[PDB]
């Protein structure tokens, strides 16, 4: 049932781990066995729950496992039986993007079933109003399909249907599963604080801001900023993979070095203004027009 699902997903990540035996986060060779190990722990703890019904622990696992399988098939399809170094290598980018997604699915699973043991009914968000929004709208649930989440979020922060809502969905759905967990919502509301202007912060900082990069790794940021070494004060920003919920700002320093920093942890709008004023964050993605 659930146990059969969990056995299948374990063996599937072991296959991928063996197919990856040919580093620096996010690393598939690290994430796959850690995710497998956590799933072994989930399997044993459920053979013993939180409140059942829609969006409880069982629902989360069903959705999570069906997504993990889809993503594992994508990875499997890029790997030979037992070139990454060509410029513009499609294989390198697809693997990098998939490693990002496994990094997020590993973090989400660890947040909600640490040691195998479900805590989605007790989970507390980092920002208080976001916490209160979730629990007053979704109760003890830990996950929602996008459409229901969109509808619920709209009681407070409505998003224009169509292109904008899909852009929002892409930003929030870190695991690319079509569902929003309490964890994902935690991550989003930390990144785009403060709460009273949530979606306007998002519009300004992500949709309309040339410095915003989605689904880039640390090494992809170092590589992109190569183009800007002669432009001190060029910068971009993206979600940290190792510190989920925090921004990683990549910038070109005074000496043409490419540095990356985590500004723990005020609204990004304030970090940006303060860098602008001081002369560190002047040219988003190397371009003239700082928003």
């Amino acid at each position: 049932e659930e146990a059969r699902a969990l056995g299948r997903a374990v063996r599937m990540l072991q296959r991928l781990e063996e197919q990856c035996v040919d580093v620096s986060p996010p690393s598939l060779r690290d994430l796959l066995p850690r995710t497998a190990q956590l799933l072994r722990e989930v399997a044993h703890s459920r053979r013993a729950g939180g409140p059942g019904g829609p969006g409880g622990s069982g629902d989360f696992l069903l959705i999570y496992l069906a997504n993990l399988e889809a993503k594992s098939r994508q990875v499997a399809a890029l790997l030979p039986p037992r070139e990454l170094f060509r410029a513009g290598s499609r294989l390198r980018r697809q693997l990098a993007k998939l490693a990002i997604i496994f990094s997020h699915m590993h973090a989400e699973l660890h947040a909600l079933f640490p040691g195998g043991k479900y805590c989605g009914h007790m989970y507390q968000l980092t920002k208080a109003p976001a916490h209160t929004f979730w629990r007053e709208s979704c109760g003890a649930r830990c996950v929602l399909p996008w459409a229901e989440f969109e509808s619920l979020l709209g009681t407070c922060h409505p998003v224009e249907p169509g292109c904008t809502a899909l852009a929002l969905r892409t930003t929030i759905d870190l695991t690319c599963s079509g569902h929003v967990s309490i964890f994902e919502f935690d991550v989003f509301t930390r990144l785009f604080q403060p709460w009273p202007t949530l979606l306007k912060n998002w519009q300004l900082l992500a949709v309309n801001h040339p410095g915003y990069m989605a689904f880039l790794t640390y090494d992809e940021v170092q590589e992109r900023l190569q183009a800007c070494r002669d432009k001190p004060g060029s910068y971009i920003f993206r979600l940290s993979c190792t510190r989920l919920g925090q921004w990683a700002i990549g910038y070109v320093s005074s000496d043409g070095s490419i540095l990356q920093t985590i500004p723990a942890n005020k609204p990004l709008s304030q970090v940006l203004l303060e860098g602008q004023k001081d002369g560190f964050y002047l040219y988003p993605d190397g371009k003239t027009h700082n928003p």
Binding site: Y218, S253, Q260, T261, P263, V271, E274, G275
Partner: peptide, 8 residues
């Protein structure tokens, strides 16, 4: 070294 000090 990976992530460096916030240059504020």
């Amino acid at each position: 070294q990976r992530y460096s000090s916030d240059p504020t």
